[PDB]
Structure 1
């Protein structure tokens, strides 16, 4: 995790995906001043083991596509750092039934 101040040079960033398996992430200071997950509206998300996911699917008879999706650059998807394929479980409050379980895969 690398925290830059005002910005990074377009010559540098093109050096992150050049050493797998390892992975790197770029975050701006001004964006981390406040934690978005703390916001009234943002419900808590949760990563899912490639075990817990292969489950969710089987239990609903779903194919990867039929699953609601979250953006690879989505604020929270970055907060947790998902990866194309990882599924997040979204649990929130509800004025119809206290809590509601939702799932979001990633693209």
Structure 2
């Protein structure tokens, strides 16, 4: 019961990296928060993790808001209830809506009730995404053979389609449920620039449109 603190601290780091990679403001120094510091701030006087102290909000960076004018705020919740029931989910949904968050990242420990799951798409235009803690211990996008995926702005996409005489329907595709698409929270119509980690320039990358 000490290696579970370490696993949580690592899941925490991955969530921060995911949010940073999506274009929200999180410092790398924060992403790299030392284990001791984590214990000192997010664990109680007896040394036990209090996930309710970990939840946080994130806003777009200045560079992101200029490219994505309609990009809103994001809320990350680490559920303190192992198996998430309908009532626990509803209170999370209520928070997202009332505080006007555009995206809600819902991290859970073991599972989420079927009834609870029925609430994920209940508050448009906001979207809620769910992630299992065990899957966040290691950042799947940090693998050497997984290239860098970067979402293009509407302007960039238009410029791409114009430069190559193509309709968006003629671009290589990426499935909505693709593991990297899920990581970035991609939506139908968005395009990602793909840069192999073996190449040393963002030039000639590949492009895929989300389904």
TM-score using structure 1 length: 0.89
C-alpha change, 1:41 and 1:87, in structure 2 (3 Å) is same
In the alignment, is the contact (CA less than 8 A) between 2:144 and 2:197 conserved in 1? no
* Match of residue 58, structure 1, among 162, 167, 181: 162
Q: Which has the higher helix share?
A: 2
- Cα offset for 1:90? 0.3
Structure 2 gaps, min length 5: 1-104
Q: 1:29 to 1:44 in 2, by over 3 A?
A: same
Number of equivalenced pairs: 107
Runs of 4+ in 1 over 2 A off after TM superposition: 93-100
How far is the alpha carbon of 1:99 from its aligned partner?
6.4
After TM superposition, give the deviation of residue 33 of structure 1 in Å: 0.9
Higher CA-based Rg: 2
Task: Report the CA distance shift for 1:41/1:59 in structure 2 as closer, same or farther (over 3 A).
Answer: same
* Structure 1 residue ranges without an equivalent (≥5): none
Distance in 2 separating the partners of 1:48 and 1:96: 19
Report which structure shows greater RCO (CA 8 Å, sep ≥6): 1
Deviations 1:70-104 (A, max 9, x none): 11111111111110111000011558999641001
Q: Secondary structure at the match of 1:12?
A: helix
